[PDB]
Amino acid sequence: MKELIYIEEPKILFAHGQKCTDARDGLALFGPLNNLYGIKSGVIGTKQGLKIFRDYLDHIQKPIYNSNSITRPMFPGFEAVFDCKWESTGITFKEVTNEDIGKFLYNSSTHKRTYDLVSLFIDKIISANKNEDENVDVWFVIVPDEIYKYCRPNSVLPKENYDAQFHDQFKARLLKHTIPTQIFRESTLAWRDFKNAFGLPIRDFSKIEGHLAWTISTAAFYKAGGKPWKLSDVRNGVCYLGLVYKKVEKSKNPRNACCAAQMFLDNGDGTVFKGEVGPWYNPKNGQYHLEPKEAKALLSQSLQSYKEQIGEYPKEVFIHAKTRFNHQEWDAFLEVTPKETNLVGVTISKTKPLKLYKTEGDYTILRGNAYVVNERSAFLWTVGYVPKIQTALSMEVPNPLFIEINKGEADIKQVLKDILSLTKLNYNACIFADGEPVTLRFADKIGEILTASTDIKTPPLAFKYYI
Amino acid sequence: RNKIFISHATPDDNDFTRWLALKLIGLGYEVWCDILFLDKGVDFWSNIEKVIREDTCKFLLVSSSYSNQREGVLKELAVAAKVKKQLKDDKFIIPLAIDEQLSYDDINIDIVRLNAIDFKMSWARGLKDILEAFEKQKVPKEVASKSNLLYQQIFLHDKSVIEKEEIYDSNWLSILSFPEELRFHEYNWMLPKRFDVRELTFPAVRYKNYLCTFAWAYDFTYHLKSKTIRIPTEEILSGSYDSNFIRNAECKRLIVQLLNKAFELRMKDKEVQEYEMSNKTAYWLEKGKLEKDKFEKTMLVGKQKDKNWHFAISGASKLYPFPVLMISSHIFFTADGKKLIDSSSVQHSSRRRQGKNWWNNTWRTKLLAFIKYLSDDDTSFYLEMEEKVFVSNEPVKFKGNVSYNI
DNA sequence: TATACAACCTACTACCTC
RNA sequence: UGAGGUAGUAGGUUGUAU
Ligand SMILES: [Mg+2]
């Protein structure tokens, strides 16, 4: 017999100073935080891709309904939500012919084909950025399904320095120019026409169309420079940081690159959420612990960024990771940290197999239920049942996060509240919440993009150039 | 009379007034405000007076710090009071408190007595209150699906949990009784101290120069005092032991290895085949082992179309926070009742297809049935090392103070 | 240098639903 | 890669003794 505590659902701040718990409800009822006047889009691909993009953009403007609106709120139209214009009349189209695609698409090798396709798609972007007089907010790269299927690291042809992934290499090669691009698939916007066996579409968006519209609109609005929502219950000068380690694979010797994501509250009552980059490297294979010098450099850079943004030093700095810090790297961390600042290192994992089944009901466990094992351990149900939407966020019994304070002293309830609030800042999607904290997820995205190339020297901190 | 008149300070309270007017129009009502419906080139004060006198059925008054002593708002309020007196309608004037900086003692007396609607905390809760008041007062409304959807969204936006206790069943099998002590046998003889380490009938692994086991020295005679230390289990579970002979964490690792080996060997003798995974091992029952695959009416083993699926349990002992066994559930597909498939992709795809229509109730029922069938007595089952460890067949329970009502 | 395992780590798919 | 979730398949590291 054990006791579970309940963590109150956090709120996110929308326009007019109004708070809500659901991003879709707050965006439909109130609207985004900031006002940008319009979105000018640049489309790349074949003429069929342009027609598909124009058709989807025209379809977006009118309201779209889901099959069951009690779980997925309907999309009321882009202008009726974001009070800004994203139309098909402001499209700067760059043409990519099928012959050019097929010149390198059907050729041999997996690294050369992807490199050539990425070069063909990216030279147009660079030239139109430098040698054209039209201002483009977001560049929408429509990729035919053949390129998506045939540009995987483990892909095999159907019997006739850079990563083999099309998306990661494409985003890495575009870092020196700071061009926010959204990669779309033809089957994503034209799912109704990509049938498989007897006219049945490969992907069924019939009952989802509203949610797809919500996600696409939110991503486009964020990449264009808009602020859809912000956290309302952020604490004092405390700063949250998150470290994620990645393998640089067979590029240049066994190496591990660590990338960080940073969040805090500025003096303008908003939220600063960017990335600490310059992936710090470790030459030892299989070790995910930062060397002392690189750890000191990381903490010094993050502290300097916070001091420049605010004007003083943070009261306490929380650190999240999927691994457990050792003593040497923690001592290196503390050597730089000022006395007034309190260092807390927290480890969040999703590996402990603790499944809770409801005794009678057919639904899963309520989201937010927490099992405090002891002072420095807890099990948090970030994914589960949400009373507002009469369905769970998972399919089977969800797995809970195992949050354990590795280093330093801090209240476990406060840590759980901070993590549950951090899980609300996913701008890559318009959902209720996600299991993983957004800091770790965005550090994951940043690392998996920055590990796809080696020519990057000073990567940008903003998130619109990665997500 | 179907209009809803909205009064406000025009150059200071436009945002909330426009928001409320558009929301009310979207819900099927007909509203009148001077920022959206006043015409150009018209005598505006006479038009406002005529609208108040002959058109409005309700009079919403945005009461804030700006409009508390605004002359136009006061004139409209006075005319509204006269019209309410003529109409004998007590609920004609509804003040909406949208400002938290307006003290209760500073509100003008004409609307102090009236029951306002709180908009300071949240505009959505205030809109819900407005909708409830309008529905109760039978305010005329002329809507078709869009209005209903918006109304449902506004009502449901604030849905939350209820403080009702609930009981959750986990998948952790707790440990009740541990053996008297952990045995270290300093033999070093008997074929390089039992060089097999993987064939003895009772669980045991080799330490530096000792064998760690809960069994006696005269029990491995089929495949094969001076036993020192002999640490008790109760004293070492609390982690109060030290010294250079063996570290406490290494002791915990040794004992958890012992329970894992015991769990493997005990029910490897149950004449039940197993499945090999990437990192662990899972064990599923055969088609003919159960008569007839309905243990406690739980439908343990079935078939999808022509392939037979089997429920499997994979167990592993752990000591953190306190000694229990974590057991997980899997689904394994075989063409026949007793066979195996080497196609990993087909097995995975069919498993994902089978797991899409089970849900929490079926998962818990099958898990409990499998864990009850593996039992050896009324309320537990024992593992053998000449000693025995009793493991409860009922998983531990969790209590929550909040829940929902479907 | 290999065993064996306890305790952790990432990389890459296939599937289902929002 | 519109986005999450749950699985499966692989490899690696540390420590404990030979
Ligand atoms: Mg995205």
Automatic annotation (TrEMBL), chain A:
<dbReference type="GO" id="GO:0003676">
    <property type="term" value="F:nucleic acid binding"/>
</dbReference>
<feature type="binding site">
    <location>
        <position position="428"/>
    </location>
    <ligand>
        <name>Mg(2+) 2</name>
    </ligand>
</feature>
<feature type="binding site">
    <location>
        <position position="428"/>
    </location>
    <ligand>
        <name>Mg(2+) 1</name>
    </ligand>
</feature>
<protein>
    <recommendedName>
        <fullName>Piwi domain-containing protein</fullName>
    </recommendedName>
</protein>
<feature type="binding site">
    <location>
        <position position="466"/>
    </location>
    <ligand>
        <name>Mg(2+) 3</name>
    </ligand>
</feature>
<keyword id="KW-0479">Metal-binding</keyword>
<feature type="binding site">
    <location>
        <position position="467"/>
    </location>
    <ligand>
        <name>Mg(2+) 3</name>
    </ligand>
</feature>
<feature type="binding site">
    <location>
        <position position="467"/>
    </location>
    <ligand>
        <name>Mg(2+) 2</name>
    </ligand>
</feature>
<dbReference type="InterPro" id="IPR036397">
    <property type="entry name" value="RNaseH_sf"/>
</dbReference>
<dbReference type="InterPro" id="IPR012337">
    <property type="entry name" value="RNaseH-like_sf"/>
</dbReference>
From TrEMBL, chain B:
<protein>
    <submittedName>
        <fullName>TIR domain-containing protein</fullName>
    </submittedName>
</protein>
<feature type="binding site">
    <location>
        <position position="76"/>
    </location>
    <ligand>
        <name>NAD(+) 1</name>
    </ligand>
</feature>
<feature type="binding site">
    <location>
        <position position="116"/>
    </location>
    <ligand>
        <name>NAD(+) 3</name>
    </ligand>
</feature>
<dbReference type="InterPro" id="IPR035897">
    <property type="entry name" value="Toll_tir_struct_dom_sf"/>
</dbReference>
<feature type="binding site">
    <location>
        <position position="70"/>
    </location>
    <ligand>
        <name>NAD(+) 3</name>
    </ligand>
</feature>
<keyword id="KW-0675">Receptor</keyword>
<feature type="binding site">
    <location>
        <position position="10"/>
    </location>
    <ligand>
        <name>NAD(+) 1</name>
    </ligand>
</feature>
<feature type="binding site">
    <location>
        <position position="45"/>
    </location>
    <ligand>
        <name>NAD(+) 3</name>
    </ligand>
</feature>
<feature type="binding site">
    <location>
        <position position="114"/>
    </location>
    <ligand>
        <name>NAD(+) 1</name>
    </ligand>
</feature>
<feature type="binding site">
    <location>
        <position position="34"/>
    </location>
    <ligand>
        <name>NAD(+) 2</name>
    </ligand>
</feature>
<dbReference type="GO" id="GO:0007165">
    <property type="term" value="P:signal transduction"/>
</dbReference>
<feature type="binding site">
    <location>
        <position position="7"/>
    </location>
    <ligand>
        <name>NAD(+) 1</name>
    </ligand>
</feature>
<feature type="binding site">
    <location>
        <position position="72"/>
    </location>
    <ligand>
        <name>NAD(+) 3</name>
    </ligand>
</feature>
<feature type="binding site">
    <location>
        <position position="115"/>
    </location>
    <ligand>
        <name>NAD(+) 1</name>
    </ligand>
</feature>
<feature type="binding site">
    <location>
        <position position="104"/>
    </location>
    <ligand>
        <name>NAD(+) 2</name>
    </ligand>
</feature>
<dbReference type="Pfam" id="PF13676">
    <property type="entry name" value="TIR_2"/>
</dbReference>
<feature type="binding site">
    <location>
        <position position="104"/>
    </location>
    <ligand>
        <name>NAD(+) 3</name>
    </ligand>
</feature>
<feature type="binding site">
    <location>
        <position position="72"/>
    </location>
    <ligand>
        <name>NAD(+) 1</name>
    </ligand>
</feature>
<feature type="binding site">
    <location>
        <position position="115"/>
    </location>
    <ligand>
        <name>NAD(+) 2</name>
    </ligand>
</feature>
<feature type="binding site">
    <location>
        <position position="76"/>
    </location>
    <ligand>
        <name>NAD(+) 3</name>
    </ligand>
</feature>
<feature type="domain" description="TIR">
    <location>
        <begin position="1"/>
        <end position="145"/>
    </location>
</feature>
<feature type="binding site">
    <location>
        <position position="8"/>
    </location>
    <ligand>
        <name>NAD(+) 1</name>
    </ligand>
</feature>
